[PDB]
Amino acid sequence: GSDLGKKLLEAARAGQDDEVRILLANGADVNTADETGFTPLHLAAWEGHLGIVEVLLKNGADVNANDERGHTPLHLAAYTGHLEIVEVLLKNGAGVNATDVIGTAPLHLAAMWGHLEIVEVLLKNGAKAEAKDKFGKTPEDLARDNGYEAVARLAELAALVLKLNANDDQIIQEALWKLGNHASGGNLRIQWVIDAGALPALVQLLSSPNEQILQEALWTLGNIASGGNEQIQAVIDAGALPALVQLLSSPNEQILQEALWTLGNIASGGNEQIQAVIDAGALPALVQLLSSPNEQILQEALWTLGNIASGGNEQIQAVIDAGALPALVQLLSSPNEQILQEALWTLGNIASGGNEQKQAVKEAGALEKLEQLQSHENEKIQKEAQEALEKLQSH
Ligand SMILES: [Cl-]
Ligand SMILES: [Cl-]
């Protein structure tokens, strides 16, 4: 008539390893429940008795037993910060997204206390970071900015990067949307995207025939390329330039615009990074796009060329050798005042080179038009024409 169930509950909670073993051998119900539904596994998880947790599971304990609140052993181990028990429970099939009667999941309980190693393990095993409880609170809400956000962000970005390798374009697309959102965050977020390993996957996606994938991938890449020179170098080192140059032949004008914007951002870096753009063969396509009827594409190519021409004399000469000057001089007759200003800036950069570069500018007939625009009634164009003529005339 011994109450083996009661004795087992008490032995499990007290950490009496030998007594648990003996009670189980004598037929105690491993899934005994107390007055509010706690099983021996609940109590051992709460108290942190790893050996007893393992013995109970070996003897068939229900890893997902619910008490009357809906708490599982995983809830209790997460709440109490018992990391090794969390791992053992998950290894034995614990429900990582189980919710109690008010919608609380194990991740909520780990986050609220700052059990950040458990947070990491739960996320690694598929815990949902956006899970909301009865009052709309996510685990992030309950963490109160205790370091949870960095751990969750690391996990969210690495999962998004892995989805870029999926074999469904819709999975790739929705992941690119979220990565694009992160890249939109500017310098305070972009390094997290780089550190998640996104750049190689983004570059590889530039071979996709799916134009929506190309558009979202380029959007993310261009924003990363708007960072510092070390971030530009990561884009280059990921292999972006040959793929970007290929896309300058795209029939899609949005892809064309985004590719030029990304190339212009890269070309806004250091001299070696300008040289990478040249070495990838971008200049022929850039010069051809100066004839584009689309003014946004025209202006984006103009700006990229001006950035390239902000480099050394040999890089300026590469622009000249690609035939840019006749097209640039033509653009000084543009009715559009933005294109006129950007053409003056690019030509001024070219004119800031050496004697050889200055001579090509004069032979292209730029002096006639620079001195004419020196008196232009628009002050901005007047400035650029003045400064450009100065660069041409100095040294
Ligand atoms: Cl533990
Ligand atoms: Cl922890």
Kindly identify the ligand whose nearest atom is closest to the C-alpha of 46.
1
Report the distance separating Cα 304 and Cα 117, nearest Å: 46
Ligand 1 center to residue 255 CA distance, Å? 52
Ligand 1 center to residue 50 CA distance, Å? 6
Task: Answer yes or no: are the C-beta atoms of 189 and 232 closer than 8 Å.
Answer: no
Ligand 1 center to residue 79 CA distance, Å? 11
Ligand 1 center to residue 78 CA distance, Å? 9
Ligand 2 center to residue 178 CA distance, Å? 28
- Here the tokens at position 239 are 């292999």
Report the distance separating Cα 214 and Cα 99, nearest Å: 39
Short-list 279, 285, 286, 284, CA closest to 300: 286
Ligand 1 center to residue 110 CA distance, Å? 13
Ligand 1 center to residue 307 CA distance, Å? 57
**b/e map of 151-178 (b: 16 or more CB within 10 Å)?**
bbbebbbebbbebbeeeeeeebbebbeb
Task: Answer yes or no: are the C-beta atoms of 27 and 60 closer than 8 Å.
Answer: no
Render 163-211 in DSSP notation, one character per residue: HTT-S-HHHHHHHHHHHHHHHTTTHHHHHHHHHTTHHHHHHHHTT-S-H
Query: Long-range contacts: 248-255, Cβ < 8 Å, 24+?
Result: 248/282, 248/285, 248/286, 248/289, 249/285, 250/214, 252/211, 252/214, 252/215, 253/294, 253/297, 254/215, 255/211, 255/214, 255/215, 255/218
Kindly identify the ligand whose nearest atom is closest to the C-alpha of 115.
2
Ligand 1 center to residue 44 CA distance, Å? 10
Ligand 1 center to residue 85 CA distance, Å? 4
Report the distance separating Cα 284 and Cα 255, nearest Å: 18
Short-list 387, 348, 342, CA closest to 366: 348
Please provide residue 96's backbone torsions phi and psi, each rounded to the nearest 5 degrees. -70, -25
Kindly identify the ligand whose nearest atom is closest to the C-alpha of 84.
1
Ligand 2 center to residue 69 CA distance, Å? 24
Experimental method: X-ray
Ligand 1 center to residue 21 CA distance, Å? 19
Ligand 2 center to residue 150 CA distance, Å? 14
Task: Answer yes or no: are the C-beta atoms of 326 and 364 closer than 8 Å.
Answer: yes
Kindly identify the ligand whose nearest atom is closest to the C-alpha of 51.
1
Render 2-68 in DSSP notation, one character per residue: --HHHHHHHHHHHT-HHHHHHHHHTT--TT---TTS--HHHHHHHHT-HHHHHHHHHTT--TT---T
Q: Which residues contact 43 (CB under 8 A, 6 or more apart)?
A: 9, 12, 13
Kindly identify the ligand whose nearest atom is closest to the C-alpha of 89.
1
Ligand 2 center to residue 138 CA distance, Å? 18
Ligand 2 center to residue 13 CA distance, Å? 21
Ligand 2 center to residue 156 CA distance, Å? 18
The residue written with tokens 């660069």 in the block is 391
Task: Answer yes or no: are the C-beta atoms of 285 and 248 closer than 8 Å.
Answer: yes
